[model samples]
Target chain A: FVNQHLCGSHLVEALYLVCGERGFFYTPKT
Target chain B: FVNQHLCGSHLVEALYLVCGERGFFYTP
Candidate 1:
């Protein structure tokens, strides 16, 4: 997905960098 | 995790973006 996921790692790391370990939990529901 | 904790969360993000604010509804 999304051109082989290049941005995937980027986005996550960014979120992780900003949000830290629990970054994953803050994701807003659609 | 995502790329070390990257891929999972981001994959979920991409899916959500394309899924268009609720397009997935259940698929993503």
Candidate 2:
């Protein structure tokens, strides 16, 4: 599944860089 | 806000490129 290989914090940080604050709480529903 | 200027599919494709299948459902 998604994020299985990475930590939540890492994912959050990456998303922040790619998507910014609006992506902080964003979670893929797949 | 994030994705404000981009479409959902674009974001999805970008994420896929950056993260791959593991990132398909990985929003943040």
Candidate 3:
């Protein structure tokens, strides 16, 4: 919803970066 | 990286939902 309007990619990147930064476990699908 | 190409916020939501669904320790 939020991404659909604005920089969804940026926010996704933000989320991914935040997750990685926070040491959360996340795997990206190729 | 993938989210960069995808619906990122939607992906974030998807990720958050997935983390919750998968029983992973994720808080968003």
Arranged by TM-score with the best first, the candidates are 1, 2, 3
**Where does candidate 1 chain A have its weakest 10-residue lDDT segment?**
A21-30
Prediction 3 TM-score vs. true: 0.26
Q: Which residue pairs of candidate 2 clash?
A: none
lDDT of 3 at A9: 39
The residue pairs in collision within model 1 are: B1-B5, B2-B5, B2-B6, B2-B7, B3-B6, B3-B7
Report the lDDT tens digits of candidate 1 across residue range A1-30.
Answer: 344543533654455455555434324464
- When sorted by lDDT, best at the front, the candidate numbers are 2, 3, 1
Compute the lDDT of residue A22 as modeled in candidate 2. 61
In CAPRI terms, where does candidate 2 land?
incorrect
lDDT of 2 by residue, A1-30 (tens): 233455566565566656665665665789
The better candidate by DockQ, 2 or 3, is 3
Instruction: Mark the regions of model 2 whose C-alpha exceeds 4 Å error after superposition.
Output: A1-30, B1-6, B26-28
lDDT of 1 by residue, B1-28 (tens): 3355445555545765675444332222
The segments of candidate 1 whose C-alpha lies over 4 angstroms from its true place after superposition are A1-30, B1-5, B25-28
Error of 1 at B26 (Å): 6.9
Model 1 misses residue B3 by how many Å?
Answer: 5.5
Q: Which candidate is the best by TM-score?
A: 1
Candidate 3 local lDDT, A1-30, one digit each (tens): 344543433544565555653534444443
- lDDT for model 1, please: 0.47
Better of 2 and 3 by TM-score: 2
